[PDB]
Amino acid sequence: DTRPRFLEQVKHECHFFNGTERVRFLDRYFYHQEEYVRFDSDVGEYRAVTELGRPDAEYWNSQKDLLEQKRAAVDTYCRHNYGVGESFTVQRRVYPEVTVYPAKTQPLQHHNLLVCSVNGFYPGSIEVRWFRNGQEEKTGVVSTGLIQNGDWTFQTLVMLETVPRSGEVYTCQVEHPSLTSPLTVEWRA
Amino acid sequence: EEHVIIQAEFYLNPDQSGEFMFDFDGDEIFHVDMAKKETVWRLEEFGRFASFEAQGALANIAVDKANLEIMTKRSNYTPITNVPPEVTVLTNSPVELREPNVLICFIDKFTPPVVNVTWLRNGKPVTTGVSETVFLPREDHLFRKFHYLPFLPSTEDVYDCRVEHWGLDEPLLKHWEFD
Amino acid sequence: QYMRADQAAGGLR
Numbered sequence: 001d002t003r004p005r006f007l008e009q010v011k012h013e014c015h016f017f018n019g020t021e022r023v024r025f026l027d028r029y030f031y032h033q034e035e036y037v038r039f040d041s042d043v044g045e046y047r048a049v050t051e052l053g054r055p056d057a058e059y060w061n062s063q064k065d066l067l068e069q070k071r072a073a074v075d076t077y078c079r080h081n082y083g084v085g086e087s088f089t090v091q092r093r094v095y096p097e098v099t100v101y102p103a104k105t106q107p108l109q110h111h112n113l114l115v116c117s118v119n120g121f122y123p124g125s126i127e128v129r130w131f132r133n134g135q136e137e138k139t140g141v142v143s144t145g146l147i148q149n150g151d152w153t154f155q156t157l158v159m160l161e162t163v164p165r166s167g168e169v170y171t172c173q174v175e176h177p178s179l180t181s182p183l184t185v186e187w188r189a
Numbered sequence: 190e191e192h193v194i195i196q197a198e199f200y201l202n203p204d205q206s207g208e209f210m211f212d213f214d215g216d217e218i219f220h221v222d223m224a225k226k227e228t229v230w231r232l233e234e235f236g237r238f239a240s241f242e243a244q245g246a247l248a249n250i251a252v253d254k255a256n257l258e259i260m261t262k263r264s265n266y267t268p269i270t271n272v273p274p275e276v277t278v279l280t281n282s283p284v285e286l287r288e289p290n291v292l293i294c295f296i297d298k299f300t301p302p303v304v305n306v307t308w309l310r311n312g313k314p315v316t317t318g319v320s321e322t323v324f325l326p327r328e329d330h331l332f333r334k335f336h337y338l339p340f341l342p343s344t345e346d347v348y349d350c351r352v353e354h355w356g357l358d359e360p361l362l363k364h365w366e367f368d
Numbered sequence: 369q370y371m372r373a374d375q376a377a378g379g380l381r
């Protein structure tokens with residue numbers, strides 16, 4: 001289809017600091033990709049982001065009932081929804097499954113790449129480390145980054161560029177809020 | 190901060206498409222199906238603890254529909270610029286022969302939120318067992334999308350995620366095959 | 369245990 005498209009977006013945002021101690025509420029309006037007016041609980045009124053949203057800022061700021069609704073959103077909307085979903089969102093904990101397998105950087109005879117597959121964890125914050133016989137190797141570590149599977153689980157590959165020796169023991173260490181002690185998986189040649 | 194909940198909505202002309210969803214730290218809590226007027230929880234366990242009245246969402250899309258007409262006039266009918274997507278194909282877990290797995294097609298950084306996605310195995314459209322997500326919001330206000338295909342790893346099967354978008358001249362094919 | 373939606377503000381005109 002060649003016909004031009006026209007897109008409108010609205011985003012009601014709730015930003016939480018230390019639980020529900022400090023809460024920030026944003027009411028943002030977008031034409032295509034461009035925000036043109038927003039309400040911010042730090043201000044208490046609508047403010048035009050671009051000249052396109054100035055009529056809506058003055059029009060909405062003249063409606064005190066509307067403004068009183070937006071000023072109460074941190075209590076009736078943000079803290080409320082946080083309380084409804086905190087059991088399966090804020091407190092969701094899934095520990096990862098850790099798999100180690102060798103690979104090749106280039107078509108070589110021997111393997112020169114140790115992959116540490118860390119799959120299915122939540123939340124996303126995680127720290128993965130490589131050790132060669134109990135000594136951490138910070139050189140030659142390449143990662144795929146934090147991959148979002150889109151189903152409330154994350155995954156990441158952390159690869160070590162190394163030439164394995166006989167009797168060498170590598171171990172991949174994983175730290176995650178779902179764990180109380182570091183998860184380790186070892187690999188030897 | 191430490192947690193962000195976003196109620197994201199959009200309306201699109203002339204497609205007359207509307208969406209309403211909740212985002213938590215980048216994951217979808219639920220969305221409302223406009224046709225059935227139902228709350229759809231991303232994980233079915235979510236519906237056992239929380240509920241949502243789906244008509245409040247349609248009332249918002251009705252206002253977003255009216256605001257879009259106002260903003261289109263205000264911008265002198267300035268249309269949107271197509272931003273083509275980045276496409277990545279990957280598996281849910283490390284691949285083992287004849288051990289079940291899931292193919293994930295990640296479509297990212299694109300607008301408008303219209304896309305045609307096709308899973309191909311050996312160059313043929315596959316429909317069995319596929320699933321997808323609604324259009325998910327980005328902080329740069331583009332969109333992201335997920336498509337899934339459970340499969341059994343075999344050395345004789347190759348796959349492709351074919352993505353069409355008005356910002357693309359040719360359909361984007363992202364390949365996957367077993368080592 | 370219902371999640372509250374926030375109202376969209378109707379623009380001018």
Ligand SMILES: *[C@@H]1O[C@H](CO)[C@@H](O[C@@H]2O[C@H](CO)[C@@H](O)[C@H](O)[C@H]2NC(C)=O)[C@H](O)[C@H]1NC(C)=O
Binds near residue numbers: 001002304305353355
């Ligand atoms: C998704 O596929 C549909 C169906 O092929 C596309 O819709 C058609 O586009 C042509 C012009 O290219 C029009 O003449 C038709 O009227 C459209 N509708 C139908 C039902 O055929 C649609 O453009 C594709 N979308 C993307 C993003 O590629």
Ligand SMILES: *[C@@H]1O[C@H](CO)[C@@H](O)[C@H](O)[C@H]1NC(C)=O
Binds near residue numbers: 018019021
């Ligand atoms: C975190 O919340 C507790 C609640 O009692 C509060 O005492 C504490 O000061 C908060 N943290 C900070 C840094 O304010």
Ligand SMILES: *[C@@H]1O[C@H](CO)[C@@H](O)[C@H](O)[C@H]1NC(C)=O
Binds near residue numbers: 052263264265
């Ligand atoms: C639309 O056109 C009018 C009339 O020329 C002009 O005053 C206004 O600034 C234009 N706005 C945009 C967004 O182009």
